[PDB]
């Protein structure tokens, strides 16, 4: 019922590990489908090959900008920006998958995986999933970011798709 997608992470080509997520389509369907669809590439565009352009250790890893690759791009499968479905789920800890935005109702394709409890984001960013496996692949990634987000090596979603 709840779809599971995976990301095969690579650090400058060198494959790191696999991180799979459970998307909560049961409570946040439109947002979960957008991520799922974008993870399979069934629409002609998606996450395969994009980089995690902003990694702030002890905060989160952010990626999903497949258009401009610098945090200023992205598009949803519904167009360039869809609304915030709801804020039923909260940033309760590490592994939480949430939508990055530019303020209310500007969801596109950018997301971020929390590597810490980030309550200050509750109500501002739509939580739609969680890390099922490979949480410490996400942790190991923190190793290539910086307090200001800049990353040393290029972290890419080498491959991604749907498992279930």
């Amino acid at each position: 019922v709840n779809p599971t997608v995976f990301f095969d992470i690579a650090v400058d080509g060198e494959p790191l590990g696999r991180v799979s997520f459970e998307l909560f389509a049961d409570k946040v369907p439109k947002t979960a489908e957008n991520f799922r669809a974008l993870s399979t590439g069934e629409k002609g565009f998606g996450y395969k090959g994009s980089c995690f352009h902003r990694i702030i250790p002890g905060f989160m890893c952010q990626g999903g900008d497949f258009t401009r690759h610098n945090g200023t791009g992205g598009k949803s499968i519904y167009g360039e920006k869809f609304e915030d479905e709801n804020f039923i789920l909260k940033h309760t800890g590490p592994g939480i998958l949430s939508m990055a935005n530019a303020g209310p109702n500007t969801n596109g394709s950018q997301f971020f995986i929390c590597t810490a409890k980030t309550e200050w984001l509750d109500g501002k960013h739509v939580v739609f999933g969680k890390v099922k496996e490979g949480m410490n692949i996400v942790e190991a990634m923190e190793r290539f970011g910086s307090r200001n987000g800049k990353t040393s090596k290029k972290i890419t979603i080498a491959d991604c798709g749907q498992l279930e």
């Binding site: 905060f59 989160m60 952010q62 945090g71 949430s98 990055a100 935005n101 530019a102 303020g103 971020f112 980030t118 200050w120 984001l121 501002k124 960013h125």
Partner: peptide
């Protein structure tokens, strides 16, 4: 820039 968001999440801050």
């Amino acid at each position: 820039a968001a999440p801050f």
